A paper describes a structure:
Here, we explain the mechanism by which the phage AR9 non-virion RNAP (nvRNAP), a bacterial RNAP homolog, recognizes the −10 element of its deoxyuridine-containing promoter in the template strand. The AR9 sigma-like subunit, the nvRNAP enzyme core, and the template strand together form two nucleotide base-accepting pockets whose shapes dictate the requirement for the conserved deoxyuridines. The catalytically active AR9 nvRNAP core enzyme consists of four proteins that, when pairwise concatenated, show about 20% sequence identity and cover the entire lengths of the universally conserved β and β′ subunits of bacterial RNAPs. Promoter-specific transcription is performed by a five-subunit holoenzyme that, in addition to the nvRNAP core, contains the product of AR9 gene 226 (gp226).
The structure of the promoter complex has been determined by both X-ray crystallography and cryo-EM to resolutions of 3.38 and 3.80 Å, respectively. In the most populous class of the cryo-EM reconstruction and in both available crystal forms of the AR9 nvRNAP promoter complex (i.e., AR9 nvRNAP-Pro-cryoEM and AR9 nvRNAP-Pro-Xray), the enzyme bound not one but two copies of the P077 promoter-containing forked oligonucleotide—the downstream copy (as designed) and (fortuitously) the upstream one—resulting in a superstructure that resembles the complete transcription bubble found in open complexes formed by other RNAPs. Moreover, in crystallo the nvRNAP molecules and the oligonucleotides formed a train in which the upstream and downstream oligonucleotides belonging to two neighboring unit cells pi-stacked and formed a continuous double helix. Considering that the X-ray structure of the AR9 nvRNAP promoter complex is more complete, has higher resolution, and is very similar overall to the cryo-EM-derived promoter complex structure, the former is used below for the description of various structural features of the enzyme such as the conformation of the active site and the folds of various domains. The structure of the −10-like 3′-−11UUGU−8-5′ template strand promoter motif is fully resolved in the electron density map of the AR9 nvRNAP-Pro-Xray dataset. In this pocket, the −10U base is wedged between the side chains of gp226 I207 and βN gp105 R363, forming a stacking interaction with the latter. Its Watson-Crick interface forms hydrogen bonds with the side chain of βN gp105 K375 and with the main chain N of gp226 V206 and I207. Most importantly, the C5 atom of the −10U pyrimidine ring is only 3.9 Å away from the Cβ of V206, suggesting that a C5 position methyl group would clash with the V206 side chain. In the promoter complex, the bases of −11U and −9G form a stacking interaction such that the C5 and C6 atoms of −11U butt against the sugar-phosphate backbone of the −11UUG−9 segment, leaving no space for a C5 position methyl group.
Numbering used by the authors:
A (entry chain d): 1 to 426
B (entry chain c): 1 to 484
C (entry chain C): 1 to 649
D (entry chain D): 535 to 631
E (entry chain D): 99 to 146
F (entry chain A): 291 to 406
G (entry chain D): 244 to 389
The structure:
DNA sequence: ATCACATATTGGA
DNA sequence: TCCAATATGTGATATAATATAGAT
């Protein structure tokens, strides 16, 4: 009950098998198994035999050096201003070569480096934190002191990072999202930092700016993951977490239907056939005494042109189903009540050319739509329990206007029916 | 027969379309628009523009065993030869580069990669268009914008006056135009360029005490500092358009100043360089490079399309003088009046080549401690025959023929759009005015031809419209304001 | 504001320079701006009609629009002499000609249909160019090939003329819908052309869908029509599966890839990178070899016949002719290699042009010239429709019936005006027919015209005086039966309310038609109807199971574009607003089951498909697993890379 | 007390016919109790509360799902300005995660 | 005609908002609509 | 885009229906299939023959147990027919060191001349 | 009767205004309804007669005109005896007065709204989600009217 | 590019 | 000396169907 955002320590999750050592993705004209597109770790794009889920996570180990956790970086930036000058390393030299900066215009804490920053993090935090405006952030940093510095960086599956090895006449081409570049960059840096012995003293100008640039690249990785993969209409949050592309869906034009109940509609041949295809294959396999693949052959032959046997099966299914082969009809935009209606199929149209959902006229006002040709979306409901659950969207439940507890005029007579009744009674 | 009478009535109709307008796409030639873009590279002193011409297309096939390949998709194109000459350290090399360009088909279409693409006229302001607190002139690459700021300055007698200080926002910095003019000509040369050497003077406090009361009665005095002051004639101050220059001059002068500093051109160059960068040692070089870039902002095509007198079209400084002295009148002009607008066709097709050339020349100008000849070669290293065609298609500058019927007169031939390269229109809300209709559109632009997907961005020209011949496809021969 | 003050009504007197598209709309003075904008969009949304007719009520600016639009007709601007004619197919040939004046050589190609985009195109009337033989002469103005929109005398018509009435047919006209008779539905038919490419490699082979045991044809010939809505089908060949799958190559199997299209073939072009000898060996691709040899023979003919013209130094050849000759010479040249999408392709690639006649169907949109959009609700027998049984006009039936509720509210009075004028034109024509004197007929006609448009009256007087007596009799008779042209210019020369008042008070005999079984006496009259591009086939989609994305979630495929599928199979998106509306039902478990089984979870999807495939067809009850959804896995991985992990409290 | 009256008066001015109970629910969801406990309404006097705008209401609220799946994901995950880590309240929209 | 809705409302209150009375309301709406179509086709409506 | 799932599910359910038919027809228990499968390894020629027999009905599944069930069903149905050697071929196991039979010109030409 | 060229310009300008308005409202309506629906999605209802809400805590409303009285139907109010009693919309005695009413905003139940604070409409709308009903009822007429 | 939100200087008081 | 105003800069964010394609 409920959801809580929690910080995670990658040290418990890390698996040595999912370790990337090669920054260059291509090796001998094929994708490297030690790169960011590793088929052994992440999986294969078009192979069922690999059997690697998208949940698989990869790791880049920056040991023995450490880095600021990017997600917390922003918070730290408010507690310790000008942290960027502190983590970056800069030193000047004389003609003879002696360090000549003399610290005339810079604070003693600035330009020390990321390693000095980690060594002096506590006292610097006490120096630059302002309680009045950042006491809560400083407390959060105290509570999560372990998560502040990390040595391992995660990289998500290559199926989410599109990578195509296309072949061109003049030259081969590689299509990748920019995020990959950043990842690769990090790897390269750590390699050039680890090939040199860390115990042996080396020039700081060769090592510390590399760490600062690595931190910048990791910050950009996090920012790009948020700004591309996880935010907006394009983002996985709005697109596929709440919404989704739905199988067993149809899109049909609307036309007036006469002489039928208000919740009963006429459905064209092709749409009902494809939407209810598997049930029809079951029925054919039982009726004709053949296996399911031959029933699929018969359905394939019947979807081309009108077949009387297939339409007889369709009407049999419409009549004998318990719930009644019901569906949900929606008109975009669904900005009003009654935009989505739980309706029932009562007739399968006998003409292959006719491809129009026959909807009742009284249903127009609830849908807030007209016969302008705009397409309505149809989602068939199969499960009986789901039928009883979505029956609350039936026209009967919307007959009672929820504002006043009275009869809803949206389901009453339209203006033409009103003219007819008025001529009759007045 | 009824058909006979229909044909007779149709042929006897008095009102007839302008055939020349229908086939105006035939009139446009690629070389005339291509010459200025090639000339842009003459910024580099070594580059010399020999010229551009169409290479003969009369080539005939010959039986070969070379195993040549041909694409299944068919494209009808023409080839343009561009000839440049580059000389470095008395070593000269002649460079010839060929670019493919769409060839007109059926007098109104192009065929590229097995697809029917039809070009579309774009509607753009002629020059000096008005935006909120600014006057803008659009050059080929960098637009020149002048922004006005309402400022208040107290008279020496204590009576405050409200004036307008105008400044340029070129190179991402708000610099007064007087700074540029001071760096170019000096303060004395700047006053003489505007012909104001008799009207404005700068003098010492003791000299002010020496001046008689009649001169104070005939002049307006603003003390820059306690030590030095400025005097401007009252008749000059009576005009607000002249008050603009005085306000800019007051904003330029600083409290820490010297008479010899005002006389020093290097001080103005240093102030400009300080506007752009804070490094004191290279401020002079920064200002010099900025003045060079300012000289290079103007292009010859912009000179030609401008309707002002050629005396004001000699160089960029003349254009800024013309704008500033007529700023109050030019600012009070309608952005949507068709007389202030024009239509263009082939010009927006050549813009990617201009962008590529500008990238190369920015590389060469900013190159440090390397062989100049090498970078000049890199300018034309990857120029390929299919570059222009690919850039035209992929950038979606050309419109694919989505026509559903045979009627093409109103869906393709007469289609105008505000969107495109150097777009004055965008999907943002404040541009709503551009979507609307203007009374000057009557008799020239269709009133109900807008598209429902993006209202106001698209429309159709009236068939009875006649553009003035030899008027650069402007709607009107002369602009809205005639500067009487 | 006062800016509009610049507009002077006196300056635009007797002028139509402000009108553009609206020029094709009669009585544009009376229509509102919204309906006019709708008409301007409809002109683009219009489709070519097989039975196009010139408008009965016209503006006379229409023929100009037809002339200046160059996509429908071809004109040989100079005088030409036919040098030669060479046949690629029976439907497509090429004419090499020479300008008699300039001396340059030029080219003219013919074809049964022209394709614009998608499935939109039109048929041609190639009779004028087909009458031309070698050494014939083309004049300075000649229509070599024309569209169906243009008639014999180059009159241009974008739609048909249909007898309409404002009627409420069993509430089938609610909102705005149209019920049309079958006879009128025949007149509202259009063309559908499709350019479908099927690519064959060495792995896949074609199937004997067309022909018998002796004759192996995998695709229809040029003259043949499509059967079973399949242009072809291909099977991948592998030696392991060859023993059983290759047998019965005549019938379809589940492994085959089919290609869907419907109509009549009119041009096939095959580009082959395979050695011709190997094709000679293969029996299944024999038809491909035959058409390859046909193209090569046509190119050999053009080379042999135009080498003297192209390679003559003292000769001028048009760039089109030169490019055509060069392409054919490349095709006949050895070591020729074809590339598609900048890539050498295996096997061959076949491009088919398919043409069919598609009629009016339910859901198809037809509109008038005044923004009166409408969707065809019912196509009914012409007998089961309003028929008049009183007076001289007995037996007349209504071709279309329109909604009469909000005609005034739509602010489009010109619809009613056109209907009224054609309705009174019916009476004028009947009065002409009853008279036995030709002079009396022309007197009645000139009277009515002078009452409507005076300039048309003067022009018709001149035209009648110029005609021969037999030609005048033909004119009168065809006017009596087919209809009378009436001119209502858009802005100046239109017929207003007072003119119609005068017309109605003069013709006292004219009154509403009393129709069978209908109490209200109504008016029937011809108005112009055009067909719009939007149709039930345009946005129809039906997906059950289709290709899954790389992320395991449903996504669209390009199969419908490549004609590999019959319907779109495009997945619908459940929006966030749709989720909010569905949340009215407080059964979030059922909504989550819907989304998981249809999209998010693979295991639930497989379970659903298995339950529907085997079990009780009439009572379907499913039990779903609680395995985490793939969307939840992707979310978990992304947040893990962020450094955060959502955990339930 | 005055925002409900302003809402009803503006509804009458616009002609929109919606019962005031639904409008009261709309306004109730916008307000946030400083105590964040409904039981304080049982006390004698009205508890401490603060009414927010519709965008700030769910962002400054205590539900993780309706805030993460709505607007400003970046500022929620990077900064604690919205106190996102402290949110623990449940929602039906949680099942979509 | 304006009172028709009221009747329906009272109907919903008279039978205790039963599901059956709601079904009957929907049936009455359908039948009345069919008869309205009949009246409209037999007794024509026209604008001129 | 990867391949669609529905048609593969159709084929797999057809295979399951066939093995259920086989189990019901001969009253097969797990012990009888164990007797037929006792110490039996996968044979390429055997899976090829199984593909050939059911080539009109479905496509073979990857699970070896399903293929062995289909093997027993094919063996029984072929034994009902006059065919005799092929069931025994299915029952036995192939040798790991498979040796291709040298080409028999007399036998090959006799088969070529055969009317079948 | 006809039109003039100046009148035609005015008419076309109005039509362009209408199209621009439609284009912008297409974008605005979804945003507004999305915010309100996302906030009110979690509104609930419980079957408890009395939540213990204080009578003094019941907020007040001014019966200024007839429409304000029309807004409150199936709504409770406190008489001068001190007992909760239903409101009858037809009675005009309440006009010109200020009445304190049990309100959903003053509900003291954290689990959900009680039967008293929602009113007698509870049993009618208990089948569907309440906040969604509310947001739809507010968002449809407003956007359509605009 | 519109709206919000937050700093940086600066003329002003 | 301080400060509120101005100004600059930062940051989120955006409809609806749809034609593709940088030396030897
Ligand atoms: Zn309560």
């Amino acid at each position: 009950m409920g959801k809580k955002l929690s910080l995670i320590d990658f040290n418990e999750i890390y698996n040595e098998e999912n370790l990337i050592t090669r920054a260059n993705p291509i090796e001998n004209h094929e994708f490297s198994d030690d790169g960011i597109y590793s088929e052994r770790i992440f999986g294969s794009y078009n192979e069922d035999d690999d059997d690697k889920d998208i949940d698989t996570i990869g790791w880049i180990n920056i040991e023995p050096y450490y880095i600021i956790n990017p997600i917390l970086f922003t918070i730290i930036k408010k507690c310790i201003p000008s942290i960027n000058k502190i983590i970056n390393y800069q030193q000047s030299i004389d003609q003879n070569g002696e360090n000549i900066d003399l610290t005339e215009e810079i604070g003693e804490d600035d330009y020390i480096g990321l390693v000095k920053f980690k060594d002096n993090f506590d006292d610097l935090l006490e120096k630059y934190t302002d309680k009045k405006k950042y006491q809560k952030e400083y407390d959060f940093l105290i509570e999560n002191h372990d998560k502040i510095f990390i040595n391992k960086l995660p990289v998500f599956s290559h199926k989410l990072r599109p990578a195509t090895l296309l072949t061109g006449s003049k030259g081969k081409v590689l299509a990748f999202d920019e995020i990959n570049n950043y990842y690769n960059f990090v790897i390269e840096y750590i390699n050039q930092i680890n090939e040199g012995v860390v115990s042996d003293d080396s020039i700081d100008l060769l090592l510390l700016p590399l760490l600062y640039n690595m931190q910048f690249y990791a910050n950009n990785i996090l920012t790009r993951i948020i700004s591309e993969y996880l935010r907006g209409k394009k983002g996985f949050l709005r697109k596929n977490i709440m919404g989704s592309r739905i199988n067993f869906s149809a899109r049909n034009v609307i036309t007036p239907l006469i002489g039928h109940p208000i919740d009963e509609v006429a459905m064209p041949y092709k749409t009902f056939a494809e939407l209810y295809k598997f049930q029809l294959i079951n029925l054919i396999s039982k009726v004709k005494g053949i296996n399911y693949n031959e029933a699929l052959k018969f359905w394939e032959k019947g979807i081309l042109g009108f077949n009387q046997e297939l339409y007889n099966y369709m009407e049999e299914l419409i009549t004998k189903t318990k719930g009644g082969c019901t569906f949900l009809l929606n008109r975009n935009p669904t900005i009003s009540i009654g935009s989505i209606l739980y309706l029932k199929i009562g007739l399968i149209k006998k003409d292959y050319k006719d491809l129009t959902l026959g909807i009742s006229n009284n249903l127009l006002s609830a849908l807030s739509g007209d016969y302008d040709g705009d397409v309505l979306n149809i989602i068939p409901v199969f499960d009986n329990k789901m039928k009883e659950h979505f029956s609350l969207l039936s026209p009967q439940n919307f007959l009672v206007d929820r504002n006043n507890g009275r009869f809803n005029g949206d389901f009453d007579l339209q203006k033409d029916q009103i003219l007819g009744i008025f001529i009759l009674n007045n | 027969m009824i058909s006979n009478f229909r044909k007779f009535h149709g042929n006897k109709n008095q009102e007839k379309f302008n055939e020349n307008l229908i086939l105006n796409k035939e009139n446009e030639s690629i070389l005339n628009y291509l010459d200025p873009i090639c000339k842009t590279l003459e910024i580099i002193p070594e580059i010399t523009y020999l010229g551009s011409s169409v290479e003969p297309i009369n080539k005939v096939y010959k039986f070969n065993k070379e195993e040549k390949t041909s694409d299944i998709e068919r494209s009808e194109l023409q080839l343009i030869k561009m000839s440049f000459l580059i000389e470095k350290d008395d070593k000269k090399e002649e460079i010839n580069k060929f670019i493919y360009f769409p060839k007109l088909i059926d007098s109104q279409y192009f065929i590229i990669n097995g697809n029917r693409y039809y070009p579309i006229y774009q509607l753009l302001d002629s020059g000096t268009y008005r935006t909120n607190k600014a006057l803008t002139l659009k050059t080929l690459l960098m637009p020149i914008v002048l922004r006005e700021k309402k400022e208040t300055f107290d008279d020496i007698n204590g009576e405050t006056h409200t004036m307008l200080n105008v400044d340029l926002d070129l190179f991402k910095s708000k610099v007064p135009f007087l700074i540029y003019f001071f760096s170019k000509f000096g303060f004395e040369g700047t006053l003489e360029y505007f012909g104001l050497q008799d009207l404005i003077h700068v003098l010492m406090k003791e000299d002010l005490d020496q001046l008689d009361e009649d001169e104070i009665n005939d002049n307006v005095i603003f003390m820059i500092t306690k030590n030095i002051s400025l005097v401007v004639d009252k008749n000059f101050f009576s005009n607000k358009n002249n008050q603009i220059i005085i306000a800019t001059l007051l904003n330029c002068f600083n409290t820490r100043i010297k008479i010899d500093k005002i006389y020093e051109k290097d001080y103005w160059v240093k102030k400009l360089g300080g506007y752009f960068t804070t490094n004191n040692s290279n401020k002079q070089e920064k200002g010099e490079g900025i003045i060079l870039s300012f000289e290079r902002i103007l292009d010859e095509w912009t000179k030609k399309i401008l309707r002002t007198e050629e005396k004001n079209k000699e160089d960029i400084y003349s254009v800024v003088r013309w704008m500033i002295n007529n700023y109050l009148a030019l600012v009070k002009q309608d952005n949507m009046n068709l007389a202030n607008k024009r239509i263009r066709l082939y010009e927006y097709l050549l813009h990617p080549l201009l962008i590529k050339f500008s990238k190369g020349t920015y590389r060469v100008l900013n190159n440090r401690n390397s062989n100049k000849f090498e970078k000049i070669k890199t300018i034309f290293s990857n120029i390929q025959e299919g570059f222009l065609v690919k850039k035209i298609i992929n950038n979606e500058l050309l419109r694919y023929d989505n026509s559903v019927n045979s009627i093409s007169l109103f869906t393709l031939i007469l289609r105008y759009t505000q969107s495109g390269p150097q777009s004055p229109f965008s999907s943002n809300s404040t541009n709503n005015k551009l979507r609307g209709l203007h009374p000057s559109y009557l008799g020239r632009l269709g009133l109900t031809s807008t598209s429902a997907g993006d209202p106001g961005a698209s429309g159709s020209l009236t068939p009875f419209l006649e553009l003035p011949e030899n008027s650069y496809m402007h709607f009107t021969e002369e602009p809205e304001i005639n500067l009487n | 504001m006062d800016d509009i003050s610049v507009i002077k009504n006196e300056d635009y007197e007797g002028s139509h320079r402000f009108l553009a598209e609206e020029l094709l709309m009669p009585n544009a003075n009376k229509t509102d701006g919204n309906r006019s904008t709708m008409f301007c969009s409809h002109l683009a949304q219009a489709v070519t009609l097989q039975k196009a007719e010139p408008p009965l009520v016209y503006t006379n600016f229409e023929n100009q629009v037809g002339k200046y639009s160059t996509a429908g007709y071809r004109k040989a601007n100079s005088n030409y002499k036919v040098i030669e004619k060479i046949y690629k197919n029976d439907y497509n040939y090429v004419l090499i000609v020479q300008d008699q004046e300039t001396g340059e050589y030029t080219l003219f190609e013919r074809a049964e249909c022209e394709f614009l985009t998608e499935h939109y195109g039109f048929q041609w009337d190639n009779d004028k160019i087909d009458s031309l033989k070698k050494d014939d002469t083309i004049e300075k103005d000649t229509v070599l090939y024309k569209n169906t929109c243009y008639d014999e005398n180059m009159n241009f018509g974008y739609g048909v003329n249909l007898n309409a009435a404002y009627f409420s047919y069993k509430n089938e006209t609610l909102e705005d819908a149209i019920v049309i008779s079958e006879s009128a539905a025949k007149k509202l038919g259009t063309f559908s052309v499709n350019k479908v490419k099927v690519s064959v490699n060495t792995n896949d082979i074609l199937l004997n869908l067309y022909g018998d045991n002796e004759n192996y044809k995998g695709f229809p010939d040029i003259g043949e029509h499509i059967k079973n809505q399949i242009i072809a089908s291909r099977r991948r060949f592998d030696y392991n599966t060859a023993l059983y799958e290759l047998k019965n190559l005549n019938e379809m199997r589940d492994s085959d890839t089919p290609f869907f299209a419907d109509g009549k073939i009119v041009d096939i072009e095959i580009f082959s990178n395979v050695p011709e000898e190997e094709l000679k060996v293969q029996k299944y691709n024999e038809q491909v070899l035959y058409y390859i040899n046909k193209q090569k023979e046509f190119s050999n003919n053009v080379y042999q016949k135009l080498k003297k013209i192209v390679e003559g130094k003292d000769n001028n050849v048009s760039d089109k002719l030169l490019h055509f000759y060069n392409n054919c010479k490349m095709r006949i040249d050895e070591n020729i290699s074809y590339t598609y999408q900048n890539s050498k392709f295996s096997g061959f690639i076949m491009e088919f042009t398919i043409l069919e006649e598609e009629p009016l169907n339910k859901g198809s949109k037809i509109t008038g010239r005044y923004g009166n959009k409408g969707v065809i609700s019912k196509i009914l027998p012409d007998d089961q429709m309003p028929t008049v049984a009183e007076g001289r006009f007995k037996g007349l039936k209504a071709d279309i019936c329109l909604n009469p509720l909000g005609v005034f509210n739509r602010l489009n009075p010109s619809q009613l005006i056109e209907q009224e004028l054609n309705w009174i034109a019916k009476f004028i024509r009947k009065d002409m027919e009853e008279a036995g004197s030709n002079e009396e007929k022309v007197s009645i006609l000139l009277d009515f015209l002078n009452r409507v448009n005076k300039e048309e009256t003067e022009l018709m007087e001149e035209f009648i005086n110029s005609l021969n007596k037999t030609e005048l009799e033909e004119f009168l008779n065809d006017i009596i039966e087919n209809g009378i042209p009436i001119c209502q210019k858009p802005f100046f020369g239109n017929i207003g309310l007072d003119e119609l008042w005068e017309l109605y008070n003069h013709y006292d005999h004219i009154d509403y038609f009393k129709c069978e079984g209908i109490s209200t006496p109504l008016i029937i009259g011809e108005i112009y109807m055009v067909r719009l591009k939007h149709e039930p086939h345009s946005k129809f989609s039906a997906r059950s199971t289709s290709f899954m994305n790389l992320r395991g979630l449903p996504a669209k495929s390009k199969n419908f574009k490549e004609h590999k599928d019959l319907y779109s199979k495009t997945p619908v998106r459940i929006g966030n607003m749709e989720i909010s509306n569905l949340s009215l039902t407080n059964e979030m478990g059922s909504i989550m089951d819907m989304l998981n089984s249809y999209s998010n979870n693979e295991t639930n999807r497989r379970e659903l498909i298995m339950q529907l495939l085997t079990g009780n067809p009439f009572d379907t009850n499913i039990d779903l697993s609680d395995v985490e959804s793939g969307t939840s896995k992707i979310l978990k991985s992304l947040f893990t890379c962020l450094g955060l992990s959502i955990d339930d409290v | 007390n005055e925002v409900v009256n302003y809402f009803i008066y503006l509804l009458n001015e616009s002609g929109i016919n919606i019962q005031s109970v639904h409008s009261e629910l709309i306004i109730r969801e916008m307000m946030k109790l400083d105590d964040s406990d409904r039981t304080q309404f049982k006390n004698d006097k009205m508890p401490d509360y603060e009414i927010f705008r519709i965008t700030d209401a769910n962002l400054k609220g205590d539900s993780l799902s309706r805030s993460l799946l709505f607007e400003q994901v970046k500022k929620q995950l990077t900064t604690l300005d919205y106190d996102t880590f402290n949110k623990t309240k449940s929602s039906i929209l949680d099942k979509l995660l | 005609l304006k009172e028709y809705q009221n009747y329906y409302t009272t109907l919903l209150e008279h039978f205790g908002y039963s599901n059956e009375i709601k079904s009957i309301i929907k049936d009455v709406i359908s039948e009345l609509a069919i008869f309205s179509g009949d009246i409209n086709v037999t007794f024509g409506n026209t604008v001129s | 885009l990867r391949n669609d799932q529905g048609n593969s599910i159709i084929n797999e359910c057809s295979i399951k229906q066939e093995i259920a038919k086989i189990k019901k027809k001969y009253n097969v228990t797990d012990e009888v299939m164990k007797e037929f499968i006792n110490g039996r390894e996968l044979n390429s020629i055997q899976i090829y023959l199984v593909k050939i027999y059911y080539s009109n009905k479905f496509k073979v599944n990857s699970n070896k147990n399903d293929i062995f069930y289909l093997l027993y069903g094919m063996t029984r149905e072929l034994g009902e027919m006059n065919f005799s050697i092929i069931p025994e071929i299915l029952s036995c196991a192939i040798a790991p060191n498979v040796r291709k039979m040298n080409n028999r010109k007399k036998l090959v030409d006799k088969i070529i001349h055969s009317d079948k | 009767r006809g039109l003039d060229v100046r009148s035609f310009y005015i008419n076309a300008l109005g039509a362009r205004k209408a199209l621009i308005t439609n284009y912008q409202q297409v974008r605005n309506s979804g945003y507004l309804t999305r915010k309100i629906s996302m906030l009110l999605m979690d509104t609930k209802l419980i079957d408890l007669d009395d939540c213990g809400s204080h009578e003094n805590n019941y907020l007040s409303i001014n019966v200024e005109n007839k429409d304000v009285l029309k807004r409150f139907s199936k709504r409770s109010y406190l008489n001068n005896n001190g007992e909760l009693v239903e409101i009858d919309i037809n009675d005009e005695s309440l006009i010109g007065q200020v009445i304190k009413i049990p309100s959903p905003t003053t509900c003291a139940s954290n689990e959900g709204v009680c039967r008293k604070c929602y009113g007698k409409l509870f049993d009618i709308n208990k089948d569907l989600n309440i906040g969604m009903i509310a947001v739809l009822l507010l968002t449809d007429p407003l956007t359509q009217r605009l």
